[PDB]
Amino acid sequence: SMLDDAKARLRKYDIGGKYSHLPYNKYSVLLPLVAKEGKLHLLFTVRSEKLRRAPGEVCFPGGKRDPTDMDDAATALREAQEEVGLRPHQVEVVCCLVPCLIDTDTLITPFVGLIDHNFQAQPNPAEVKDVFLVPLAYFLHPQVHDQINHIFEYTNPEDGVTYQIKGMTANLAVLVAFIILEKKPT
């Protein structure tokens, strides 16, 4: 099946807890995979305009590890619940992808999660201005704009709204698309 195939692919790139004990400032993100209309999608947030870091930017759910978290996956799930109402029974964490090093002292660990088909986002407006889906296949043929760094523009055909996706968030989306969608018979 589509979902068993995606999970099998993802597991081959799992690094597990290999880098998780290193003494960094630690953040986790959840890369949430949603199956709709027979295709996989990634779920993104738009950060609230009143957040201090990166207001109004497109971002995966996530945040800083705190002492309650059993592990880095727990960070991702706790933050996703706070931000978009995703409950732990609604997500299967499949793997941990390559972590992202930033600012010399920070390590961001991405987890891919399969999201239940009955999940509907309940975003906390203090943190999240918007939640939207992008088909995973978009990231194989994105609409690129050069700002010099590359920016993806995705227009939701449901409503004509265009979102800009860039940086780590864009990079991770492409990685997931490659992992899951490469070398597939039609």
Ligand X SMILES: COc1ccc(CC(=O)Nc2cccc(Cl)c2)cc1
Residues near ligand X, by CB under 6 A: 27, 29, 45, 47, 51, 59-63, 83, 102, 108, 127-128
Question: Residue 83 annotated as binding?
Answer: yes
Comparing CB distances to ligand X, the nearer of 63 and 99 is 63
Comparing CB distances to ligand X, the nearer of 23 and 185 is 23
Which residues are CB-contacts of 40 (< 8 A; sequence separation ≥ 6)? 2, 6, 33, 34, 135, 136, 137, 180
Asked if residue 61 lies in contact with residue 83, where contact means CB atoms within 8 angstroms, the answer is yes
Return d(Cα 62, Cα 78) in angstroms, integer. 8
Closest CB 183 distance from ligand X, rounded Å: 30
Comparing CB distances to ligand X, the nearer of 9 and 169 is 169
Give the CB-nearest residue to ligand X.
Answer: 62
Closest CB 5 distance from ligand X, rounded Å: 28
